[PDB]
Design a binder for this molecule. Sequence first.
Ligand SMILES: *[C@H]1O[C@H](CO)[C@H](O)[C@H](O)[C@H]1NC(C)=O
Ligand SMILES: *[C@H]1O[C@H](CO)[C@H](O)[C@H](O)[C@H]1NC(C)=O
Ligand SMILES: *[C@H]1O[C@H](CO)[C@H](O)[C@H](O)[C@H]1NC(C)=O
Ligand SMILES: *[C@H]1O[C@H](CO)[C@H](O)[C@H](O)[C@H]1NC(C)=O
Ligand SMILES: [Zn+2]
Ligand SMILES: [Zn+2]
Ligand SMILES: [Zn+2]
Lengths: 343, 9
Amino acid sequence: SAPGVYVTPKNSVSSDIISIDWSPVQTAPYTYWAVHNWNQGGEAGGYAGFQQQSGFDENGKRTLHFAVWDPISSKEAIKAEYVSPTSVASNFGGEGTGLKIQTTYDWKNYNWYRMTMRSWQENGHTKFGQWLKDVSKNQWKLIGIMDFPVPNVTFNYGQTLFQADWLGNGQDVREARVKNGYGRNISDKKWTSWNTQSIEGQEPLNNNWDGGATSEYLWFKAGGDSRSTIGTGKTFTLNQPSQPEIGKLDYDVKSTYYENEKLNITWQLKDSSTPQFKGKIEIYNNENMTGQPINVINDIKSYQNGISQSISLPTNTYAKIVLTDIFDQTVEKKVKIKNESPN
Amino acid sequence: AATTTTPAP
Ligand SMILES: *[C@H]1O[C@H](CO)[C@H](O)[C@H](O)[C@H]1NC(C)=O
Ligand SMILES: *[C@H]1O[C@H](CO)[C@H](O)[C@H](O)[C@H]1NC(C)=O
Ligand SMILES: *[C@H]1O[C@H](CO)[C@H](O)[C@H](O)[C@H]1NC(C)=O
Ligand SMILES: *[C@H]1O[C@H](CO)[C@H](O)[C@H](O)[C@H]1NC(C)=O
Ligand SMILES: [Zn+2]
Ligand SMILES: [Zn+2]
Ligand SMILES: [Zn+2]
C-alpha cells in the first residue's frame, strides 16, 4: 500500500559474491527491505534482506529473510543445508513455490548491517549462502545455506534493492539507507563497485515516496507524508572506494591431538575475523610436510570448526590446517599432532 | 502474506 521503492546499481554484472550495507531509520510494520535480488523470472530467482514483521520498533519482530524459487529445469527439492540457531527454513507457496529461511535478528535503527551472499558450485549443484555482519559489534554470522539442484547458476542478473509494504499500511512511513554495494565478477574475480545507483518509485504515477544521497549513503522513504523531491527517480553517486574493505581471516587452533585412535583437531575464529567458508586438513608423517600426506580431511564446511575422526596414525605426525574465508582469503597453520593429549 | 518481485518489463 505504501508505494515500492527500488534502488538499482548502474553497473552490476554476473557475480558470485554480492554485498551491501543497510541501516534502518523508520520501520513501519509489514516492510521488507530486500537488499539483494537476482535472476527474476529465471532459474534460481531469489532475494534476501530484512523485515519488520510486526510493530514499529525494536520490540516488534525483526528478521532477516532469504528465499530461492523452485527450479525450472529439475524436479529435485531445494535443501536447507544449514540454518543458524534463530533461523527457520520452510517451503513457501501461493507466490510461486520455493524455499525460504527466516531468521529472528535484533537489528537496530541507525546501526549498519552488511549482508553478503555467496554462490558456489559443488557436487553438480549450486549453493547459495547468506552472511551478516553487525557493523557496530564488528561480528560476522553465518545465517543459512541453500542447496539448489541445478549447476552453473549465479547471481546472474537483476541486482537491485527494494523497500516494500506487503500488507497495506500506506499511512506509515518506512525509510532506510544503503552504501558499500559491491559484487565479485564471475568473469575475472575482480570487484565491481556500485558507486552509482538509481532510486526510483515502483509506481510512476505515485509520488508518495522520496530519495536522495549524502556523501556517505543513499536514502529512501515511502508512505505517510512522503512526497518525491526527485520526480519519478534520479541517479546518485557515492564516493566509495573502487575496492571493498575486506577484513582478515584470523583463528586460533584449540586442539590438535591423537589419543585412543581418535584424531581431534579444532579451531575458533577470532570474533573480529572474516567468516569461514571452508577448511581442509592434511596430515604428514614429517615436520617439513614433504611428500604426500598420509591422510587428508577435505570439505570441512563453513559451519564446522574441526574434526574428530577414528584413524590410525604413526608416532610423529603434523597437521597442515588450511582455512579459507568467504572472500577466498586463506590462512594455513602447521601444528604438530600431540600424540596422546587427554592422556 | 505475499512478498512479490517483478520480472524484467
Ligand atoms: C515474503 O515475505 C513475507 C512476509 O514475511 C512472507 O514470509 C512471504 O512468504 C515471503 N515470500 C518469499 C518468497 O520468501
Ligand atoms: C510484487 O508484485 C505484486 C503484484 O503481484 C505487487 O505489484 C507488489 O508491489 C510487487 N512488489 C515488488 C516489491 O515489486
Ligand atoms: C520476481 O523475482 C523473484 C526472484 O527475486 C522471482 O523470480 C519471482 O518469480 C519474480 N516474480 C515474477 C512475477 O517474475
Ligand atoms: C521489476 O519492476 C520493478 C518496478 O516495478 C523493478 O524495476 C524491478 O527491478 C524489475 N525487475 C527486473 C528484473 O527488472
Ligand atoms: Zn541433484
Ligand atoms: Zn595439499
Ligand atoms: Zn563443501
